[PDB]
């Protein structure tokens, strides 16, 4: 199905749709079509039902391994019951426990993911897609839903195309059709019909695409699923296979730990089979070892962290497309920010005017008129004419009732400020543009930095060709050969240029954007009344104009910017300002917001201070630099790296969209994670190139928001600091949880090794091995994801991805060599106490394994002479197993308490985490219940502990706390020392 209006002529368009090509349909017609044809929204496809995701949670991660373990336990119980009489129910009560644990963990993870997904979804509909449509001859910004078939819309740079529209008048318009064609090369658009194929023609846009630059009026021809995208079943929002670094680290750790655990389990299975075990017991032992040596519930901690971050970002108005991309935001080491719209409020008020070789203070003052300055000579009239003709900004529909300053303008900030000022002094810009026929207009772009227009002169002495131009004063003055003073055209000598430079220094030095203006009367001999102007041809005299003056408008820095910049520069993040404005204005703004501090001088600043030329000054004497954009063109890759690594305070002025990409790639080459804050279409590739891209929720275009990984819904620069802090907190909590989880592996594998080596009775059994792991390592480890941020979370340098990893050689060393060893010693001490208080002294246990485990030697002798039956001494052995589990609980109290923080005191951290205290209380309650519940001896072989057998692990639980406290005190006292080098994980 391929039917369109691409080959249809313009004459039938008015007849077919019943809408004017210029004025368009009225509000009543738009409402009728909307009520008839419906809204402009694709039908949301239901991807997966709720039961699909719940099963994915149930059978994801180590939960499948636990399902396998439970199934094998049930099979072992079935075989045992079928073979023997009076079978043991250990396998049944173990399989039930494993299945219940899997179900509970899956339900919890599903609930957390549902919360996170709902919170993330609540932001997709928050941002309304705004489209500019000409209705009743006036342009209005409406939602994309209300766009109907028939009306004409305006598409410009960075504006997402609302619907399938037929271009009727495009200038400089290039569209990006990577969604359909696949190539990112822009394609030009012209009203004329070129290609027969509907897709290959150049006079229609096929929706879901964007215009990189230029502007185009086009009639919307299709709406909703009737467009090309709606016909095909391909998913428009196709997620790419992008893996975040934190996810890669987690996956690598999971793979390594699973391999290690499987190796240990297989080795222990073989060793137990060598020690005359039984198959139905050896397989259960292997399952216990494998399950206890893998960190199940690690993914639940990650899910809780993501949900907490999603909750926190929602209160700061920070849309995040991928919640796992906040770790990179916390790992950010460089921030490249734009001056206008990010570090400034983007509210421009005209402040000063330089003309007639004089600076005039301009104040709006809707009432009481100007302060001291007046109409002056005809130079002001010429400047007002230039500003009126050059501007393409107009007020919104039905807005000519309120005062001009409060009125809304649908143009750029500078254009809006100029329009308001010229309507305050002069008036009726609509009639002014009616007076002068704007035959030719060159759209403004950052590549040229000037705006040009051609008008027909209606004066008595009319050359019929007036060329008006505005733009950057240094670029503008480079071509305006003459100057207009006192209304008389005069040559531009060196003195006037020096005066202009002094005026630029005075106006720009206060932190104001300055625009220079020129008008030229084209000769009639070279150009008759009828001339065919073309962009490709030179035609009009682009050079040799007449200068008039400069208009300087203020733009105060945003209120929250200075504190955010201070926090970033105190946290170790280098803030670079990349702007297209003059170095004077950029440097003044940077000093205002705190990017360039007080006491740091530029090379030019040092030269001026010492009254010496710019040369002969050693560049290393200056830690702050303001690199001009034109100088960056001739810089080398090595030369740029010297700039980016020797200067703490770097500003880039008069840059271009490509040079921002060059700066970003250089910063990324210099081993830095770059966060680029861009809003316009001139930041689209830089946002994609940066490690973390930040757009603006209001000032940002519709392409910057689509290319960025984060959106500031209130444009607040004080949200980047919050994002960085939360990114650091995620990593801290994850590594704390991993460190706590890894401590319990040694106490669960050392008893079997000591059993084999010393031939003592078994200190710990499979049921107690799985009780240590499922009781103390899941809830307390999930409770560490709720831990608050440190006191100095934002006072530490950004983590080096290579030097500092999620799991390093110092986390493994600590967990497996100090805390795990202390816990194993505590468990062994409790086991020895229990066995010695019954008769078997510690030295009598060396070599008792063979006789202790023999079912037919029912006379095993004490150290006191008594003789024990097999079924009598196994009761004592299982009491020892229970005490080992209970002492691991006690020694893991003061391991969770010390993993609660990484470098600060626990007293300073506090007790805000209610989940951690809940986990401690519930694990000790579970231990007490397992020990003292009637019927546990028959079922799980758990026997009551005497009251004094609980305090055996107390001296070893205090040792962990004291050791950690002293080592963290040493770390703070001597930063960078041996302890922090080797012990700080």
């Amino acid at each position: 199905v391929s039917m369109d209006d691409h080959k249809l002529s313009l004459d039938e368009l008015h007849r077919k749709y019943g809408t004017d090509l210029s004025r368009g349909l009225t509000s009543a017609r738009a409402a009728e079509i909307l009520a008839r044809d419906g809204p402009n929204a694709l039908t949301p496809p239901p991807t997966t039902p709720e039961w699909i995701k719940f099963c994915r949670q149930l059978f994801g991660g180590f939960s499948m391994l636990l399902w396998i373990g439970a199934i094998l336990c049930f099979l072992a119980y079935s075989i045992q019951a079928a073979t023997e009489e009076e079978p043991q129910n250990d396998n049944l009560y173990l399989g039930v426990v494993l299945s219940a644990v899997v179900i509970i963990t899956g339900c919890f993870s599903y609930y957390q993911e549902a919360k996170s997904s709902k919170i993330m979804e609540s932001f997709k509909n928050m941002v309304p897609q705004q489209a500019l449509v000409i209705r009743n001859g006036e342009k209005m910004s409406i939602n994309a839903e209300e766009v109907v078939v028939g009306d004409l819309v305006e598409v410009k740079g960075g504006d997402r195309i609302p619907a399938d529209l037929r271009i009727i008048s495009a200038n400089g318009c290039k569209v990006d059709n990577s969604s359909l064609t696949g190539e990112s090369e822009p394609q030009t658009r012209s009203p004329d019909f070129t290609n027969e194929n509907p897709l290959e023609t150049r006079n229609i846009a096929f929706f879901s695409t964007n215009c990189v630059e230029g502007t185009a009026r086009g009639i919307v021809v299709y709406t909703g699923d009737r467009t090309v995208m709606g016909r095909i079943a391909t998913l428009a929002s196709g997620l790419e296979g992008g893996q975040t670094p934190i996810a890669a680290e987690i996956e690598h750790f999971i793979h390594i730990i699973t391999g290690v655990a499987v190796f240990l389990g297989v080795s222990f299975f073989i060793l137990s089979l060598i020690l005359e075990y039984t198959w139905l017991e050896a397989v259960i032992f292997l399952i216990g070892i494998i399950v206890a040596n893998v960190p199940e519930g690690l993914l639940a901690t990650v899910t809780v962290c993501l949900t907490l971050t999603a909750k926190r970002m929602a209160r700061k108005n920070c849309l995040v497309k991928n919640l796992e991309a906040v770790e990179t935001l916390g790992s950010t080491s460089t921030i490249c920010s734009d001056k206008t719209g990010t570090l400034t409020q983007n509210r421009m008020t005209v402040a000063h005017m330089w003309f007639d070789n004089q600076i005039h203070e301009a104040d709006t003052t809707e009432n009481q008129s100007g302060v001291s300055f007046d109409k002056t000579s005809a130079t002001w009239l010429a400047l007002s004419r230039i500003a009126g003709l050059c501007n393409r900004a107009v007020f919104q529909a039905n807005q000519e009732n309120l005062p001009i300053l409060k009125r809304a303008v649908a143009g750029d900030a500078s254009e809006s400020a100029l329009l308001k000022c010229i309507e305050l002094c002069c008036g009726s810009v609509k009639e002014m543009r009616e007076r002068y026929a704007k035959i030719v207009e060159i759209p403004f772009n950052s590549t040229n930095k000037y705006q040009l227009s051609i008008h027909k002169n209606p004066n008595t002495s009319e050359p019929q060709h007036l060329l008006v131009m505005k733009g950057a004063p240094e670029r503008i003055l480079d071509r305006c050969s003459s100057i207009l003073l006192h209304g008389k055209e005069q040559p531009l000598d060196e003195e006037l240029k020096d005066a202009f430079q002094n005026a630029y220094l005075e106006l720009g030095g206060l932190g104001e954007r300055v625009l220079g203006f020129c008008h030229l009367f084209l000769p009639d001999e070279q150009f008759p009344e009828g001339f065919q102007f073309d962009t490709d041809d030179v035609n009009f005299p682009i050079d040799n104009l007449c200068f008039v003056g400069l208009i300087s408008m203020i733009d105060p820095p945003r209120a929250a910017v200075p504190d955010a910049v201070g926090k970033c520069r105190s946290a170790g993040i280098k803030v670079i300002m990349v702007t297209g404005d003059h170095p004077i204005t950029a440097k003044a703004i940077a000093k205002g917001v705190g990017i360039i501090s007080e006491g740091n001088e530029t090379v030019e600043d040092i030269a001026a201070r010492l009254n010496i030329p710019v040369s002969q000054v050693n560049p290393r004497d200056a830690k702050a630099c303001v690199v001009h954009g034109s100088d960056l063109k001739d810089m080398t890759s090595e030369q740029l790296d010297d700039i980016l690594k020797y200067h703490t305070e770097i500003v880039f002025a008069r840059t271009s969209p490509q040079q921002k990409l060059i700066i970003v790639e250089g910063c990324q080459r210099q081993g830095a994670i770059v966060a680029v804050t861009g809003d316009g279409v001139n930041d689209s590739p830089a946002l994609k190139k940066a490690d973390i891209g930040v757009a603006m929720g209001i000032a940002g275009s519709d392409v910057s928001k689509q290319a960025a990984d984060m959106i500031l819904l209130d444009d607040n620069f004080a949200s980047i600091v919050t994002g960085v802090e939360e990114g650091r907190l995620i990593f801290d909590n994850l590594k704390k949880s991993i460190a706590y989880t890894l401590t319990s592996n040694i106490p669960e594998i050392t008893p079997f090794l000591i059993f084999i080596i010393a031939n003592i009775p078994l200190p710990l059994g499979t049921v107690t091995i799985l009780c240590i792991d499922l009781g103390t390592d899941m809830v307390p480890a999930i409770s560490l994801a709720y831990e608050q941020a440190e006191s100095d979370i934002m006072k530490r340098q950004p983590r080096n991805p290579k030097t500092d990893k999620l799991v390093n050689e110092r986390l493994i060393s600590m967990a497996y060599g100090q805390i795990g060893m202390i816990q194993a010693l505590g468990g062994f001490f409790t086991y020895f106490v229990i066995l010695a208080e019954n008769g078997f002294l510690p030295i009598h246990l060396l070599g008792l394994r063979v006789d202790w485990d023999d079912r037919w030697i029912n006379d095993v002798e004490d150290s006191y002479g008594q003789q024990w039956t097999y079924e009598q001494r196994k009761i004592v052995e299982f009491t020892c197993h229970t005490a080992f589990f209970v002492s691991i609980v006690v020694v893991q109290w003061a391991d969770l308490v010390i993993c609660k923080t990484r470098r600060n005191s626990v007293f300073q951290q506090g007790m805000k985490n209610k989940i951690l205290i809940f986990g401690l209380f519930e694990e000790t309650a579970l231990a007490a219940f397992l020990s003292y519940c009637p019927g546990m001896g028959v079922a799980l072989r758990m026997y009551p502990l005497k009251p004094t057998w609980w305090f055996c692990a107390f001296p070893y639980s205090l040792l962990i706390f004291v050791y950690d406290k002293v080592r963290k005190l040493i770390i703070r006292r001597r930063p960078g020392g041996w302890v922090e080098k080797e012990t700080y994980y």
Partner: protein
């Protein structure tokens, strides 16, 4: 006159269950703190 070969295991497990109940109640109360 005390007698060996016998321990008051009924009272021991009764008090252990009471302590487990107290710990469970306290952990629930702390979690849902108003």
């Amino acid at each position: 006159e005390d007698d060996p070969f016998f321990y008051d295991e009924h009272t021991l497990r009764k008090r252990g269950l009471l302590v487990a109940a107290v710990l469970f109640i306290t952990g629930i109360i702390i979690l849902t703190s108003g």
